[PDB]
Every structure is written in C-alpha cells, then in structure tokens.
Amino acid sequence: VQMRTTINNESPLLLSPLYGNDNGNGLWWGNTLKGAWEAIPEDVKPYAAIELHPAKVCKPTSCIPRDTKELREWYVKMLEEAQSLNIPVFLVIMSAGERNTVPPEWLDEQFQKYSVLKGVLNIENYWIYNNQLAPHSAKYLEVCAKYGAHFIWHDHEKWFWETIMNDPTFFEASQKYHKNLVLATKNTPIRDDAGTDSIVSGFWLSGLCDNWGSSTDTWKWWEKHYTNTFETGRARDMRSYASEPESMIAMEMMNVYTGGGTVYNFECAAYTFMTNDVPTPAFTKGIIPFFRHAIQNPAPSKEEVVNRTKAVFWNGEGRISSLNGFYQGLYSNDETMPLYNNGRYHILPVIHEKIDKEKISSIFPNAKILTKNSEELSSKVNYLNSLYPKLYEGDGYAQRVGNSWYIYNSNANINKNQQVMLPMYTNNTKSLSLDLTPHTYAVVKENPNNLHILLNNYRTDKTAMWALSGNFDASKSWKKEELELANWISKNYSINPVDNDFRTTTLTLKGHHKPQINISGDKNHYTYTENWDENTHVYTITVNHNGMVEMSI
C-alpha cells in the first residue's frame, strides 16, 4: 500500500492543531479548517497536516475521547470538510487514559472513505497510566499499517516510555509496523526532558519506529509558574502559556531536529498557531522559520546519528528512570526544562531493555555500551569525555552536526548572555565566536568556500498582555475567559506585536580580504555594524535584531 504521508529527514512533518467545541461551528479559538490550511505557507504545505482534537466535544471530560455518538459525528463532520478542501488531517483518538475509544473497525472504515485521513494520535497519559493503552495503541497501529497511515504517540517521562515498550503487544507491533509508527515527546510535566529525548530517539535508533519527534508545549511556562519574560513574583494564569519566548519554541524544535527527529507538534495553539483564523507571531516568526530550515536542510539521518554516537546507555541492567542525576555534568543541569547546556555528546541514546545487548552491538558496532553497573560511571563525566572530545570553548550551547554548528543561549528565564568560541573545520575562517542574548539561536554551515549564518532571536514583549485587567485563571480553560484572551491576541499580539526592542548578537570571524557579505533578514527588524582588522584578518559583525538575520560570507 502506498504511504499516505512521506516522513523522513528529507520530508519532515509539521502538525498544527484545531480543537473541537461542543457548539458554534464545532471548533474552539474562533478558528476554521479552511483558515487553518490557509495559514500554512505554500512551500510548507507539502510537509504539513492539520490535527483534529475533539477537545470540548468529549464527554464527560473535555479532551478525553470516550466513544460517543457525538464524538463520531464530530470526526465525520470534520473529515467531510477536510476531504472537500483536500486538507490532510490526523485525528486525536486516544488521550488521558481513556479505555473506551472508537473501535478499530470504525477507524478502518474512515481510512477507506477519506483519502485525506493520514493517521491518528494518542496524546498524554503519564499522569493516568493503565495497562490497556499500549495494546489499544498496537491495534490502532495495525489499522494504520493496513492503509499506509501513521500512528503518532505523544507522551513523556522515562518510567512511562520504559513501561510502554515493555508491553509485549506494543513491542511486537512496533517491530512489525515501525514504518507507520511515530513516537514523540510531550514536555508538559516539567520532568525528564533529557531522559525522554534519549529514550524516544533511542526507540527510533533501535528500529521500533521510523520517525520520532515532539509536541512542544508552552503550557510548560505555566507549570513552572513563569509569567512575563524574566519576571518573578507574579501569580500564573493562562497568559503564561502565551509567554514562552517565540525563538525558544524553535530551540525546542532544534533539539529534535539535531537528534534526527522529523515530526513537530505544538500546544497551546492559541499562542503557537492561530486565533480567529489569524496566525500568531509564535507561528509565523518562531515555528515556521525553523521548520523551513528543517525542510531546506535535512535533519541528521539515522545512519548519521548512529555513526556519530560514541556511547549508548542500555537499560538492561537497571534503567535510566533510576538515575536521576545522569545528565548533570554532561549536558542538562535541569530536566524540568528542555534547553541543553552542552552539545558535546549530542543526545546520548538510551536503549530499551527489550533490545538485546547483541543487537546494540550490531546497530552501534563502534559505541561503548554503558549500563547502570558500568564501573566507568564512577567517573561518569571523565569517561564520556574520553570518548566525546571537547569541540568548543565558552558557556553557550553548541553542537557540531556534520558540516554545521547548531548554537543557542541555554538560559530559559534568566537574562544573561552566553558566549561561544567555535573552531572551524574549513579555512573559510579559523574560528568563529558569538555573543548571544537569551532566546537567540544560530546555525553556521560551512560550505567549501563560504559560510552560511542564520541568526534568530525573535521574542515579542509580553508586557502589554500581562498588564491587562481581568480573570485569566487556567480554571477558565474551555470557557469564555479563554476566548476573551484569544480575541485579544488576534487584535493585539498578532497584529501589533511589540517586537521593536532589538538585542545584539556579536559575530566574530578570526582569521577569515575584507568580506563582502550578503545579508538579509526580517523587514525593519535589524541593523548592523561591521568591523575589519586587516592585520589580524578579524571580521566582526554586530547585529541588532528582533527576529531572523541571514548572511553568506
């Protein structure tokens, strides 16, 4: 059967969600199916689809898709709409521990009828686990395999993913139907961010799913009790899900991309996508620019990831869920948040206990297999450092990915700059340094005879939103106050974003004739000064920006 969606490093997938309403036109946040697909740029459309989450249509609990007459009616109403407009769609059919979800035969029927139905999602179960979730998912995966569709499972936490793949039914189904399976993170619960990336990407490396990815959830900002950027001492509310810096959304995507991931999903959509059919700056100037990077520059392939891996951690003699300080001293000081401090080790893969040690040896013949009982873990950092050489100086995040450097400031909500000094692997320049403010990322690609540099620090001032009067408590999710915030967003944030405060990124090329650069960027959102020292052959460009800047040197 032909695959309904091609998903790989050369053809990544961007998911944008719509949510059901139990009234009106049947959709929340004032959006429509037509407006959703209208929001997706024409160059991105070949690599995109719309997620349909029944949300408020679900009864007795919103977002929990218990099979009902009304639920089916809603799926069918939306499928009819999407089919008429040739909009590729995925249905959320499992969530939050629900055991009585739509029958596999019902889904089979819908695949038969609707060419636009590309697959289904299972989302979020770590707080409400039961032993039916894995076998149910396995059955739906088999249905997906029948029709060339994809089953996408977003979930989180080390113990949880360990538990899922220990299920004999789901482990078997994964071995059979890996082509049709996507396993993905969902960093909502502000725990296990590093371990989850290692285990989920490890499933992909182990051949249990052909693609992995993420649901990047700005509700994490609410979970942390964070408010306006860098602010302390204010009570959280729904405005917190609209306050994670736009460029930081893209940095979360970069963690997936550079780990070989290929599927990107997002919450909360009132911030990350659209309200009243007006796409938001988080979407247009955060998610879209990074997704375009991923379309234009294929993520590391499975074999590239395998080949760069010097060690793996195998859960076979004790599990990563039992080593809560594992990533300390290596690359994450704080698993409650997604940003990595260090790119020296990439994402270290964690291999699941159901994969035999002989198979690991076969997949990664050149990697050390660490286990919990490895004597080398008595000096964990020194040992890993003997395998992964130090590649840069400074306190910023930098990762070497083939012929490129991937860089960001790792400070999530502390207003402090970071610096990196990056040795270079061609004689275009000897070394390249960056001074980065928070919520700035960069990508430097070394071509044979030029450097391509991408800078993006886009972050709107959230102050105006935080200054509004009213009750925006999260207990009014799915209620009129949430619409009120969404209505404000479509008339203020999305049309008159407060993005005129520029921040400075300083780029220095040491040991680089005075370059004649080609520079562009977001209209009216950057200025720059250049400096050339002909004796030292040092070129400095000082870029003041709020948004994207691109150069070829």
Ligand X SMILES: C[C@@H]1O[C@@H](O[C@@H]2[C@@H](O)[C@@H](O)[C@@H](CO)O[C@H]2O)[C@@H](O)[C@H](O)[C@@H]1O
Among 81, 98, 157, 267, binds ligand X (CB under 6 A): 267
CB 395 within 8 A of CB 408: no
* Cα separation, 307 vs 303, whole angstroms: 6
Give the dihedral of Cα atoms 36, 42, 43, 47; nearest 10 deg. 40
Q: How far is CA 23 from CA 52, 74, 216, 303, 485, in A?
A: 16, 11, 28, 49, 19
- How many residues bind ligand X (CB under 6 A)? The answer is 11
Query: Is there binding between residue 210 and ligand X (CB under 6 A)?
Result: no
Nearest CB to ligand X, comparing residues 28 and 327: 28
DSSP three-state, residue 60: coil
Nearest CB to ligand X, comparing residues 137 and 309: 137
Considering the complex, what minimum distance in angstroms separates the CB of residue 93 from ligand X? 11
Nearest CB to ligand X, comparing residues 50 and 96: 96
Site string for ligand X, 52-71 (x = CB under 6 A): -x---------x--------
User: For 169, phi and psi rounded to 5 degrees?
Assistant: -65, -45
Nearest CB to ligand X, comparing residues 92 and 141: 92
Considering the complex, what minimum distance in angstroms separates the CB of residue 184 from ligand X? 12
Site string for ligand X, 362-401 (x = CB under 6 A): ----------------------------------------
Query: Is there binding between residue 123 and ligand X (CB under 6 A)?
Result: yes
CB 254 within 8 A of CB 300: no
Considering the complex, what minimum distance in angstroms separates the CB of residue 56 from ligand X? 11
Among 40, 52, 96, 451, binds ligand X (CB under 6 A): 96
* Cα separation, 70 vs 75, whole angstroms: 9
Give the containing element (helix H, strand E) for 275.
strand 274-275
Please provide the size of the chain in residues.
Answer: 553
Nearest CB to ligand X, comparing residues 36 and 553: 36
CB 178 within 8 A of CB 208: yes
SS3 of the chain: helix, strand, coil, percent, to 5: 30, 25, 45
Nearest CB to ligand X, comparing residues 100 and 386: 100
Pair of tokens at residue 22: 């139990």
Considering the complex, what minimum distance in angstroms separates the CB of residue 29 from ligand X? 12
Considering the complex, what minimum distance in angstroms separates the CB of residue 65 from ligand X? 8
Among 47, 75, 212, 219, binds ligand X (CB under 6 A): 219
Please report, as a single letter, which amino acid is at residue 244.
E
Nearest CB to ligand X, comparing residues 121 and 181: 121
Query: Is there binding between residue 278 and ligand X (CB under 6 A)?
Result: no
Burial group, residue 161, by CB count within 10 angstroms (0-12, 13-18, 19+)? buried
Q: What's the gap between Cα 224 and its chain centre?
A: 18
Considering the complex, what minimum distance in angstroms separates the CB of residue 142 from ligand X? 23
Among 5, 9, 185, 188, binds ligand X (CB under 6 A): 188
Site string for ligand X, 458-477 (x = CB under 6 A): -------------------x
Query: Could you list the residues that contact ligand X (CB under 6 A)?
Result: 53, 63, 95-96, 123-124, 188, 219, 223, 267, 477
